[PDB]
């Protein structure tokens, strides 16, 4: 019967993909990189300490002006900070105090948040009556909303725990495109610089590359052994890095459809909560569960420095657009700025 | 002091915001937070109505004490990805139906509901985030259990049962079997109540359990516990 053939066709296609990927590799990145100068010892000092949150900080996001922050904690308040002067611009109470993610629009007019309430709330920062209101509430996910990223002032992509990413339209509050294919809960989400593709990490130890305007998965990336919790594009948009719970960061190339380099150490036995890059892409910053953040040489696979100073688990990382500073937020209700 | 008028006004705004957050912080720091769990629909609706699309919160006050009860039903997701948000809860309320040992898991055949409830209790009580969080266990529908035990022996659910086929010993055996799953007996307690009561006794039981938990926490703070 043809049922056996239709069952084995998936395995045959997987084997063909694996063989094509293996035949496409000739020289590792370490072999090409061992003949370039090391970065050195990168030392950063805490320059600002933003205080005012009273519970675990779960997410942060930088503004496009590299000055305004947004932070979310379990108290149920979103705080917009002025990083230069350590000042609070706004304090927005939330209907649901269980928030996991926050976002800052590129135009700076909107802030989004969501969590266990299955709802992404959009907040209008610039109102004529002088207070931050709710533009609308986006409903339609059957699981907790884990990540949200703004594409423009009218579109926002949301990552949820229902094994599905969705693209929304804030003018009508509807779901323009639905992305399916993941098996487990989808945890992280990062957008391409040109805002045409985005990668998505899930709990099935896999990452996928999507097309925004077509709703079609293009590539799938394997290699991890546990849940992926963070993901971030390279500045040129041709690579991305993933952090998982097996105490290891990977680097993947979209054009080669392969893993280039792994980042791990024997002393590291704790999971990874956040992954971020530098402006040039040479330095990769990873927040860990053992109370500190490590700085990695993205080309030499070497530890360039350690960002210690947090008394609890580092849960969120962020690098400014101009690359001037990096902001770490932990579960000790503190935000630190580094240079 | 090297500051403009607008900068000083922004500083004053920041100070007012700090004051508002401080007020909200000590407003919310005196509210008891409880987390409610239960396998399927065991006693969730009964325990909610006795106190009259994702997480559901319920507000009620009892003897100058406000309560925050969170329900995590219909959250078909991995528990380990959001269970660390409830580290600071005062107590965990667990609802188990007594009249389900004769029932099948409906969605899955050849499976007992009591065993699923026991596995959920074992997962919750032995978690890394709830080492020192006390558990209030509610056993619902004792009348249905009492009127159903006269024809269906408990041996089908528990083959090792060697007791009388009546209400008191069977209920004691079930309570003991739920309590034996606690592997952290030196750091937390389990409060068990039979909660098929028309009168307003479940709220009182919750109040006494929370008072005991608060006394133990205060004694740990002062070094006497």
């Amino acid at each position: 019967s043809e049922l056996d053939q239709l069952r084995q066709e998936a395995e045959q296609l997987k084997n063909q993909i694996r063989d094509a990927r293996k035949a496409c590799a000739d020289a590792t990145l370490s072999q090409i990189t061992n003949n370039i100068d090391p970065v050195g010892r990168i030392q950063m000092r805490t320059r600002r300490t933003l205080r005012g949150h009273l519970a675990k900080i779960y997410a942060m996001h930088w503004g496009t002006d590299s000055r305004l922050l947004v932070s979310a904690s379990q108290d149920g308040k979103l705080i917009i900070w002025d990083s230069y002067t350590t000042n609070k611009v706004h304090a927005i109470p939330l209907r649901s105090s269980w928030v996991m993610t926050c976002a800052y629009a590129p135009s700076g007019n909107y802030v989004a948040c969501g969590g266990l309430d299955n709802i992404c709330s959009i907040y209008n920062l610039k109102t004529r009556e002088g207070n931050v209101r709710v533009s609308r509430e986006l409903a339609g996910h059957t699981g907790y909303l884990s990540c949200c990223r703004f594409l423009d002032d009218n579109q926002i992509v949301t990552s949820s725990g229902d094994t599905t990413c969705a693209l929304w339209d804030i003018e009508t509050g509807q779901q323009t495109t639905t992305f399916t294919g993941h098996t487990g809960d989808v945890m992280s989400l990062s957008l391409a610089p040109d805002t045409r593709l985005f990668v998505s990490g899930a709990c099935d130890a896999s990452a996928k590359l999507w097309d925004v305007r077509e709703g079609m998965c293009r590539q799938t990336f394997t290699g991890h052994e546990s849940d992926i919790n963070a993901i971030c594009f390279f500045p040129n948009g041709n690579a991305f890095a993933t952090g998982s719970d097996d105490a290891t960061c990977r680097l993947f190339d979209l054009r080669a459809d392969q893993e280039l380099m792994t980042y791990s150490h024997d002393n590291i036995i704790c999971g990874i909560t956040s992954v971020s890059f530098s402006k040039s892409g040479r330095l990769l910053l990873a927040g860990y569960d053992d109370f500190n953040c490590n700085v990695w040489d993205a080309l030499k696979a070497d530890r360039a420095g350690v960002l210690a100073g947090h008394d609890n688990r580092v849960s969120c990382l962020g690098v400014t657009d101009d690359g001037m500073a990096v902001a770490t937020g932990s579960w000790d209700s503190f935000l630190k700025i580094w240079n | 002091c090297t500051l403009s008028a607008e900068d000083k006004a922004a500083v004053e705004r920041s100070k007012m915001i700090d004051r508002n957050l401080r007020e909200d912080g000590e407003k919310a720091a005196r509210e008891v937070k409880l987390l409610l769990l239960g396998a399927g629909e065991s006693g969730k609706n009964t325990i909610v109505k006795q106190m009259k699309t994702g997480i559901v919160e319920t507000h009620f006050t009892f003897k100058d004490l406000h309560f925050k009860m969170f329900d995590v039903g219909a959250q078909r997701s991995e528990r380990k990805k959001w269970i660390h948000c409830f580290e600071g809860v005062t107590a965990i309320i667990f609802c188990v139906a007594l009249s389900d040992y004769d029932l099948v898991l409906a969605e899955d055949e050849e499976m007992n509901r009591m065993h699923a409830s026991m596995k959920l209790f074992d997962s919750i009580c032995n978690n890394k985030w709830f080492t020192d969080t006390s558990i209030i266990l509610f056993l619902n529908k004792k009348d249905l259990f009492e009127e159903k035990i006269k024809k269906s022996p408990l041996t089908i659910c528990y083959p090792e049962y060697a007791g009388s086929n009546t209400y008191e010993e069977a209920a004691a055996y079930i309570q003991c079997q739920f309590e034996d799953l606690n592997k952290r007996k030196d750091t937390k307690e389990i409060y068990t109540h039979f909660t098929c009561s028309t009168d307003t006794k479940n709220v009182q039981f919750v109040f006494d359990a929370v008072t005991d938990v608060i006394i133990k926490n205060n004694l740990k703070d002062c070094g006497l516990f």
Epitope: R67, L68, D82, T85, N87, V89, H90, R128, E129, G130, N131 | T2, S4, A5, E6, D7, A9, A10, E12, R13, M16
Partner: single-chain antibody
Framework: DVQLVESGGGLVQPGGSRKLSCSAS????????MHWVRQAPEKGLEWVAY????????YYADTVKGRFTISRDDPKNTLFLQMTSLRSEDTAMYYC??????????????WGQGTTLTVSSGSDIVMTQATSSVPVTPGESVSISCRSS???????????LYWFLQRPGQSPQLLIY???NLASGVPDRFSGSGSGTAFTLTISRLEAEDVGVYYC?????????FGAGTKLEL
């Protein structure tokens, strides 16, 4: 529907007392600082008093200290001004100005209708507009220049200079709030430029809707000082 209605005017004998009331309806009154500005019939704008959010900072002009009192009632959304020892120089039309201060804010954004009050019988920054009346034809550009005795460029890179337009028989409105930034609703044809002590407002493709008087105000240090005013005609 932002509104600021002032009442309590009329004719007052010299040496008397009068309370001015400013009622707000359409915005969060508690989060905005409030200003009082009066305009004498000599066609000039003069700053009077300021009260902050939370009533933690109150400022007065040198000509009203010890005899004018400003207070706000945030439950009732009403702003008060208690005026004592009235002189003949206090005969003016008083405006209620709304201001908010954070990073990237737009203070002096809304002005009230105004009330008319009639009385019978050194270190301050000086800002001067040389042109007091210039003719203009619709469909042509125009530039208005304002200068200051002290440089308004602070160490933080902000140049605190504001531009206002008052049409005949109307209330002033904000055009540029820090030397380059257009306010909400202002057409793009208005531009701000300058640095230090020289400033210029450019109005390309002027229409009959832009005919009025233009003012330059500094917000570097209290008291806030306006200009004489450049009047556009024809």
């Amino acid at each position: 529907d932002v509104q600021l209605v002032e009442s309590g005017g009329g004719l007052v004998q010299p040496g008397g007392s009068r309370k001015l009331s400013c009622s707000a309806s359409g915005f969060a009154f508690s989060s905005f600082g409030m200003h009082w500005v009066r305009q004498a019939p000599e066609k000039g704008l003069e700053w009077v008093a300021y009260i902050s959010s939370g009533s933690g900072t109150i400022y007065y002009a040198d000509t009203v200290k010890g005899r004018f009192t400003i207070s706000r009632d945030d439950p009732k959304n009403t702003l008060f001004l208690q005026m004592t020892s009235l002189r003949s120089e206090d005969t003016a039309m008083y405006y209620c100005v709304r201001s908010i201060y954070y990073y990237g804010s737009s203070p002096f954004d809304f002005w009230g209708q105004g009330t008319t009050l009639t009385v019978s019988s050194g270190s301050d920054i000086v800002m001067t507009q040389a042109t007091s009346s210039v003719p203009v034809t619709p469909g042509e550009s125009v530039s208005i220049s304002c200068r200051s005795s002290k440089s308004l460029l602070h160490s933080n890179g902000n140049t605190y200079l504001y531009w206002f337009l008052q049409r005949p028989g109307q209330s002033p409105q904000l055009l540029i709030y820090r030397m380059s930034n257009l306010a909400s609703g202002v057409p793009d044809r208005f531009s701000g430029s300058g640095s230090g002590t020289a400033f210029t407002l450019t109005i390309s493709r002027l229409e009959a809707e832009d005919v009025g008087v233009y003012y330059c105000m500094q917000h570097l240090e209290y008291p806030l000082t306006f200009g004489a005013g450049t009047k556009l005609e024809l």
